[PDB]
């Protein structure tokens, strides 16, 4: 089993701490453009297009778009001031072809969204968020799901993952 998955959120979300959590034990920076991350992690092999989520790598995220099992997007829980720009993104790239694209199999393609940073001072949870960002409109059918996540530790983030595995596995 093989996974293609692309990874989006604003600069500072938290991107690269995640994927890290779940790559194999063998100093994390800012992205700079983006990172293909492949790995084995169970008995399942992912390619993870780690985008860089500054907003000059932003109109890079599109090309990453084409073919995708799922996208993992990670904000920043306790940034407030910057929820109406992940509202703009999330609109902007589920206007995308590839990512509007039915299935072979008749599904959407599924997002998996961190609330990130659950530890930090003035942390939203993940009902805050969707609410905030009217997430659940902006979705329509593309099957999502939420978690609270602290991605130095791992919290949420696996469980993430599991969602994300069984929605790619039940949609192929
Ligand atoms: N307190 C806390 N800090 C976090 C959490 N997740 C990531 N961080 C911290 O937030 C900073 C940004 O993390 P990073 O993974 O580089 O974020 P990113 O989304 O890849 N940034 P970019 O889009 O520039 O590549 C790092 O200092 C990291 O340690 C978290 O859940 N809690
Ligand atoms: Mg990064």
């Known amino acids: ?3 293609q ?3 989006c ?3 500072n979300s938290g991107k690269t701490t995640i994927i890290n959590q779940v ?3 063998q100093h994390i920076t800012a992205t700079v453009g983006y990172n293909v991350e492949t790995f084995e992690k169970g008995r ?3 390619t993870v ?3 860089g989520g500054a907003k000059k790598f932003r109109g890079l995220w599109e090309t990453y778009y084409d073919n995708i099992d799922a996208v993992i997007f990670v904000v920043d829980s306790s940034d407030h001031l910057r929820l109406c720009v992940v509202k703009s993104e999330i609109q902007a790239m589920l206007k995308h072809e590839d990512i509007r694209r039915e299935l072979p ?3 959407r393609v599924p997002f998996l969204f961190f609330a ?3 530890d930090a001072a003035g942390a939203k949870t993940a009902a805050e968020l969707v609410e905030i960002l009217d997430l659940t409109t902006l979705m329509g059918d593309h099957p999502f799901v939420i978690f609270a996540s602290n991605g130095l530790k791992g919290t949420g983030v696996h469980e993430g993952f599991s969602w994300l595995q069984e929605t790619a596995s039940r949609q192929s």
């Open 44 to 46: 399942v092999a992912f």
């Open 23 to 25: 790559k194999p034990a």
């Open 116 to 118: 990130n940073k659950m």
């Open 5 to 7: 998955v692309v990874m």
């Open 105 to 107: 199999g008749g599904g």
């Open 1 to 3: 089993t093989k996974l």
């Open 49 to 51: 297009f780690d985008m």
């Open 9 to 11: 959120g604003l600069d």
